Amino acid sequence: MKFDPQKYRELAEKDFEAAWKAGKEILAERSPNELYPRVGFSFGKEHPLFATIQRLREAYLSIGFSEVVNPLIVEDVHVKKQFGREALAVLDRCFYLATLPKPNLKPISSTLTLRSHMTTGWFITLSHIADKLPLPIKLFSIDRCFRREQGEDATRLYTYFSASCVLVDEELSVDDGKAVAEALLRQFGFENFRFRKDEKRSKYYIPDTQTEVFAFHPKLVGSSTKYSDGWIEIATFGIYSPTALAEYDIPYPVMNLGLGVERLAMILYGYDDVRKMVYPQIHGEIKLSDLDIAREIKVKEVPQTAVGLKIAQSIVETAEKHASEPSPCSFLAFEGEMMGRNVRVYVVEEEENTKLCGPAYANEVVVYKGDIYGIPKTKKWRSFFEEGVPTGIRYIDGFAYYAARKVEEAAMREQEEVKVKARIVENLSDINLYIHENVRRYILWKKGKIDVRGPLFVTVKAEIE
Amino acid sequence: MKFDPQKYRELAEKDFEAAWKAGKEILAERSPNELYPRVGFSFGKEHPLFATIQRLREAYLSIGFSEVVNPLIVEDVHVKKQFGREALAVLDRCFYLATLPKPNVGISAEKIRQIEAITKREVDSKPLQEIFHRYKKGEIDGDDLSYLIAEVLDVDDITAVKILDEVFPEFKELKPISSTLTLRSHMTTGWFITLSHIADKLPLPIKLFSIDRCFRREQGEDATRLYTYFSASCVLVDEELSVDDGKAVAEALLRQFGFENFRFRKDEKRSKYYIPDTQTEVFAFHPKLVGSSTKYSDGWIEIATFGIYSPTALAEYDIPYPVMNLGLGVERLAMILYGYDDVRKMVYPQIHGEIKLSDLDIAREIKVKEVPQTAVGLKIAQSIVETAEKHASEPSPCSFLAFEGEMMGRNVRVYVVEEEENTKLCGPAYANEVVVYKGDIYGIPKTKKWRSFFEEGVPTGIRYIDGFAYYAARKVEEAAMREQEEVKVKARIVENLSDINLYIHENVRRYILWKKGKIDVRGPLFVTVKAEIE
Amino acid sequence: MKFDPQKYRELAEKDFEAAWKAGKEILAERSPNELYPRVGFSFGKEHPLFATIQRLREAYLSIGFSEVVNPLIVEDVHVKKQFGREALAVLDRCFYLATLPKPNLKPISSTLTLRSHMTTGWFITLSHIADKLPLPIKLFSIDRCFRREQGEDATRLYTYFSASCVLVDEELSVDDGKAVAEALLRQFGFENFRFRKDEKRSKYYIPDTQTEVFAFHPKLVGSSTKYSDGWIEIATFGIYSPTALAEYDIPYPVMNLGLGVERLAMILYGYDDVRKMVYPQIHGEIKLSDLDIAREIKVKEVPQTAVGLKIAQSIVETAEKHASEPSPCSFLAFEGEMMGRNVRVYVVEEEENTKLCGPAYANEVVVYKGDIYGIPKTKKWRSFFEEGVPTGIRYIDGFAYYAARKVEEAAMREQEEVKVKARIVENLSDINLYIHENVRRYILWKKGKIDVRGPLFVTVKAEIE
RNA sequence: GCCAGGGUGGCAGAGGGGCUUUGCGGCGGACUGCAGAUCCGCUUUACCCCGGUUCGAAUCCGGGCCCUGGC
């Protein structure tokens, strides 16, 4: 609450310590569902694929390449100009575009295709500048490509991102490609590199320049994979063939290096399955932290008056010191007024030979590894309390709040007495607690469990006058 | 090299394979020092501290706080308006700003000055008692290129610097004089000031942050603490606030840095600028810390602290609303994120001897000293290695024509030979390769004995004969200039890189020494090359 | 509200158009203060100084320099080692550190100082590596420095940021410094550069290498300053003198370039005064957009029942079609029930020879240039309505809501009739609208004005039974 | 912060009022040697800082730091 500086100013002139202690007066008195962890801030989380793409942009810029957007939709003649004879074979892996013929049904294929690698687009782009800009020209682009690889999914996806670059200069060799790979890859934590000639020898690359790049990453040593030794194939490059360059009037050699983004991201963020990584929602990988679930556990009925609160608070108070006493037995917890009349609240047990409260009255609700537990703070359960996240709500706590608001309803109901007792807890409900239907569906989906049980056996009585 | 597009188009349209194969002509033939890993690209690295700060900026922004710059230099009265009597304990941990006073070329040093022969060094000029009085008025540092360059003649500080020393030992006396100005020991000292100008003129709630420097002495040591540090701080101003707002903020912030669980305890200090019982310490759990050798084996560490400003203190600046303040020590977070155990090594690696090159870096630094300056010379070298590889077992004596051709318009024939008898053309270590492994440079042969090195280190791709061959070719190449006719160069026992025509820049050599690394490049090369140039 | 897919599924199988139109049923019915622009999202805004610092880090990394942290607190002997004789003069501009002597008051100066430029720290840092790392060594650091320049503030501040770098190599010249400046500055939009020898010729730089850099920025041409021609002094560099390098055992020349951050930021974000830029709160530069202020304008009393709303809504409805009718005159606006009994709401005027509503009943509240206006939608005021931000709340709108909640209070009060009328509007209050005390203090501070006036003259009567 | 043993050259490790180890390492040179060695020459006379004792202290005494077996 807002306060007056003068008061505290002079009030502190008289007695500092008193002024200081007086300060608690400005603090807000929070009710159940407004207490941590039930209250919190949220924020967006980025996706591993796009984070990686952004890291790659930075890395290329770090070594001098300028960004470009290459043609994505292209006439199949371009693949013909680039692969030569081997072109028919290549086009098999591509997708062609088809359009519905404007009915004055059946789509009609055109001669347009989606690029299968960035290269199809690089030649077009280079044709307009390779002879008009100072050398060397260093361009890069991280964008989508489409491929019909076998037409499966267990091995590959239809669309993927290629983090690609081209280097145009008068004198080039396979060494420029090795230098670029190391400089790019070192920025991602790779420490050692090995290169081997790629057996396929594609016709758009000068014979024997097509190289496969292997890099070593410590993060992968001891990995539950064949990448256990730390090495993995991560990119490929080659020097474009004059046969292809010539079909675009490019007169200089061109070093092209391409790296598959999905694989890098998997390594950086620890994924084993590409699809689980880029499409987690679609592949049931949703996930909430224990702290998240704990925040969703709320008190259903809460006292609506400042009086109600201090009542539930008192109910709890006396049960924390007389849950032992033999029954029958009775105690007065609260005495005062609300809504216009005084009231007396009693914590009791009518049954013979037993204790006031059940042995589980002090059990606390705590989340651990996706499960919700109702347990006692015993050495037996320590690990749950220290590594999970306790709600700070006990069995009585949840009940008292219900009790209070219940007499509070009697007061406004014109009654004069109310009976509210609790016996055996079987779920969150029995303890005046709930979670939104979506979180419940979540926990089932994740095959989690809710174990909130126990002998509460606690009764409260009150008489309003 | 460049090529002709039209030519390639027309040859490719008819005979594709021929054109494709011919493409190799446009590639560059690289000399030894132009080959990977000897050539490379570089890039700058980020310092862990500043990296963390930028991430913290992004994290505070993502949760709705706006950036601010708070006062850093402040009168110590603010620590008093904020702590009350406890202030003295605080100020004893702070630094005060002291400054140097101006010297007096009068009164103090003039009654006993004009009572003696002032200056002799002839520069005479009229009494600049004024141009020297203005020094008690308003001056600076570069003002020296004034009362000299445009006074008693003499451009710049040629005689300006020295005229001072041997004429007025008065400047050499000066001693700094403290003031009441202090350097904030935590962001809080400055938040109050900043908040006094807006807590009541901006829409509530007000969410501001600042990640900046603070200063705080500690036992006068470095291994016990640092004099300056960064605090990633924030303030929340609203009508209703409780410790829960501090918790919610700590979690929303820390969760973005990989922490997953939090615990809060009351701070025994119970500092006066905070409402009693609100000063909380925050402990967080981070995976990277579990199983760690550190004192945080279980993954828990105290990462921040927060509280709610005492209305007693808010009043001193006329702030009418409660405010929550959370501070995070940046250095510690950086250590966790980038894996460091010692603050000092983390932020001051260069000064604390923590410099490092990777094996790959060292390999790149191993170059070939002597290299043929001719395209034919390179061919000559290539052929030497070639014939040396073909007839390395031929019993002694023996001889082989390695290369026959023209160089400088003077026919040449180079031979690989072995004079001595009872041995072979090439020594046993002729095919040894130079490889960098765990900081050392080794001259070794590919033997099951050294798999580890060739597999986990970085091969330079250069062998004893390769290095020697380049040396030789350059030699004959030189003779072919001295108008010579017969050249002979030999290699016997190898002691170091030098004996292989290999070298490393002097800084790299020192790095290796400093890191207690070694260079073991030895072995029996015993290879000879003879040339006849006409 | 949550709905059932099956219903809409089959319901759409019967008649799509009907299903579609039925969709409006799931939308939320928003009450006054929950309507745009009264509801919104916020987000953090970064400060120009720190944004610039971050752009500078990127720019240095873009050209190959690695980040470093240099010593900030230093023994004054280092300035002595670096400036030689000219050192006494330099120390005058520095700050020394003093500590309170632990009383078993008066601070005692030590021999420690704060660096006045990054250079004081570079030498220390370079001493440990210039002879142990491959050349060239390219380091940079953007951090704080302290200076007692004249001891004023109208010209300079005590602390500032230096965006600095060093380049260590065997062969260097003043040309390396020019190359670095252009590469760094081009990334900030500067297009042309001129260099002139700095007259001061500091002793830590090789004589005649200390250079001043001038750069041209189009953003500054036509600027209300002498920077009108587009040029401005933006940085300085030089090659460290062997005299100084030698005191640290550094055997190679070193190119050092430093650029003052505050000036760059001012240019990038358009500021004329350094202090107004880095300390806007302290120099009264707080600022809220019109849209922000509009959002803070809320309806004080709002009908608490769905019935109350449709009532206020109806009051408004009939006044929009009978504000003309001559008075005395009366109309029935609503008839139905709430809280347990039927009610009839009347919009009327008892006075003779006049109109039902005042001529200002339809005036709208709109914010423009920091001022709040109550005006009619007339060609005369068009520019205000098209360039400012209207609240969407008119004079009647604000009143009706009050009327409604007022009968709503009579219903629960057991009454049977209520009189609520409005005459002359003099402020936001008279129209059932308010703004939080801090926004009001804001508007006064910014010397803004509130002009909400006019003849409302509208009366409402109702009788609950 | 309270008990105790101590702080030596690049690394290692003896010793103990002035002369004084030593080993590794390293650097320069020599060697008819076909494998990772041989011989000669080599330092910055090394023992934290402030006082005290003394003709003289690294070695004796007091204090300030720094490492360790301890609460």
From Swiss-Prot, chain B:
It catalyses: tRNA(Cys) + O-phospho-L-serine + ATP = O-phospho-L-seryl-tRNA(Cys) + AMP + diphosphate. Its EC number is 6.1.1.27. It holds the Pfam family SepRS_C. Keywords: Aminoacyl-tRNA synthetase, ATP-binding, Ligase, Nucleotide-binding, Protein biosynthesis. SUPFAM superfamilies: Class II aaRS and biotin synthetases. Belongs to the class-II aminoacyl-tRNA synthetase family. O-phosphoseryl-tRNA(Cys) synthetase subfamily. HAMAP family: Sep_tRNA_synth (MF_01674). Catalyzes the attachment of O-phosphoserine (Sep) to tRNA(Cys). This is O-phosphoserine--tRNA(Cys) ligase.
